[PDB]
Amino acid sequence: DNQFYSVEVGDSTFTVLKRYQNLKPIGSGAQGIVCAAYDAVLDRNVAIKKLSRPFQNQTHAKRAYRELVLMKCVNHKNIISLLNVFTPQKTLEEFQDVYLVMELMDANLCQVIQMELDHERMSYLLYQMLCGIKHLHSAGIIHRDLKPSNIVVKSDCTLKILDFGLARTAGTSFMMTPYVVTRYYRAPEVILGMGYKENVDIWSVGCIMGEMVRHKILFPGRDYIDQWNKVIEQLGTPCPEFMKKLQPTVRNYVENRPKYAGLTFPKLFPDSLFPADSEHNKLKASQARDLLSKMLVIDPAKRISVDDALQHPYINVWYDPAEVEAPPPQDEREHTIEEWKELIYKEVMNS
Ligand SMILES: *CCC(=O)Nc1cccc(C(=O)Nc2ccc(Nc3cc(-c4c(-c5ccc(F)cc5)nc(SC)n4C)ccn3)cc2)c1
Numbered sequence: 001d002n003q004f005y006s007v008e009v010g011d012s013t014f015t016v017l018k019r020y021q022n023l024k025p026i027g028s029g030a031q032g033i034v035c036a037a038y039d040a041v042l043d044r045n046v047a048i049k050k051l052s053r054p055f056q057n058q059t060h061a062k063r064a065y066r067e068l069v070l071m072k073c074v075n076h077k078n079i080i081s082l083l084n085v086f087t088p089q090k091t092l093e094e095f096q097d098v099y100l101v102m103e104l105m106d107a108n109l110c111q112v113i114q115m116e117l118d119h120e121r122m123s124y125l126l127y128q129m130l131c132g133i134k135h136l137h138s139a140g141i142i143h144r145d146l147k148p149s150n151i152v153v154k155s156d157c158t159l160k161i162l163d164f165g166l167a168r169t170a171g172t173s174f175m176m177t178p179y180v181v182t183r184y185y186r187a188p189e190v191i192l193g194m195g196y197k198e199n200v201d202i203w204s205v206g207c208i209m210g211e212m213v214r215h216k217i218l219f220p221g222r223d224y225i226d227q228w229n230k231v232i233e234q235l236g237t238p239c240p241e242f243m244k245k246l247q248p249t250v251r252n253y254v255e256n257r258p259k260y261a262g263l264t265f266p267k268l269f270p271d272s273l274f275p276a277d278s279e280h281n282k283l284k285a286s287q288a289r290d291l292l293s294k295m296l297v298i299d300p301a302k303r304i305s306v307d308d309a310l311q312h313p314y315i316n317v318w319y320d321p322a323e324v325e326a327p328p329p330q331d332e333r334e335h336t337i338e339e340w341k342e343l344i345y346k347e348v349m350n351s
Pocket residue numbers: 026027029034047048049082100101102103104105106107108109110111149150151152162
């Protein structure tokens with residue numbers, strides 16, 4: 001339409017409503033390309049993400065669809081809120097591309113992770129992640145795949161989570177895919193198919209926190225086997241009560257491995273990794289390790305809750321009940337490509 005215009009961006013074309021001006025690439029990911037733009041209607045800077053033919057892959061289709069639907073089920077400053085959703089195509093038959101628009105953020109969390117460790121920044125970033133997760137949980141959404149690639153940050157250290165994680169059933173049966181999926185941030189109970197509760201998400205917060213300290217991914221498994229091995233190498237073989245919760249076939253798989261004692265948290269995260277040379281810095285290194293030791297707990301029956309993390313002395317200087325308790329607003333079958341296409345098209349057309 002006359003309502004759209006096209007901009008060349010590397011290999012791609014962004015065909016966007018004319019309100020969006022001065023497009024500039026940010027970059028690309030598994031789920032689309034992103035540009036910054038000025039929105040002349042709102043008089044503010046936005047990020048625009050293009051989803052190309054998401055209906056052509058069942059995993060991509062389900063993600064796009066569930067994320068359009070769940071967008072309306074949350075309302076919190078630490079979770080994505082779309083300003084606009086559109087397609088330049090005019091009929092179901094011609095439909096190919098979805099464009100999502102939100103507030104422009106300044107950086108990916110990975111860029112912050114690369115910066116020198118600072119307790120005020122790390123604690124504030126973790127506090128916001130935990131506020132977001134708590135909000136998701138109150139809306140009935142237990143994420144199970146929180147990772148730095150879906151977290152963005154502004155220059156004022158404010159943070160947003162951009163995705164809603166896994167289908168409800170994921171983590172209720174053993175995880176190995178026909179191809180590589182990375183699972184560096186997924187909880188033990190999920191990857192082993194044990195079922196899960198809310199504190200499944202605390203594991204992933206612990207992975208992120210640890211990564212902030214080390215500047216390195218904690219458990220970078222090459223495949224599902226190596227993933228588990230990176231975990232037990234560092235944290236130790238889990239307790240028999242945890243093994244007893246495994247389906248017998250899974251239990252044999254898990255136990256047919258070396259037995260590890262695990263390393264203490266001071267060895268996992270040495271003093272040298274933290275700011276030194278003041279009582280404040282010594283105490284904060286101790287509190288950070290304490291919190292790490294409570295989140296990076298293989299057995300979810302022994303792992304800290306979201307509320308306990310929020311109330312931990314490392315985090316709680318930021319605690320504001322208006323942020324922590326902000327309330328959310330008042331179907332996962334499989335489908336063919338054509339079914340997914342229509343479902344997604346209908347969601348786009350209706351908001
Ligand atoms: C750690 C490695 C790295 O990222 N390096 C690096 C080096 C130099 C520059 C950059 C950089 O350009 N990063 C940057 C700039 C601006 C943003 N803003 C942004 C991105 C996103 C976004 C979206 C999205 C989702 C929904 C929507 F409606 C619009 C946009 N989807 C993704 S991929 C999960 N991103 C990142 C939203 C809002 N603002 C980010 C990063 C990086």
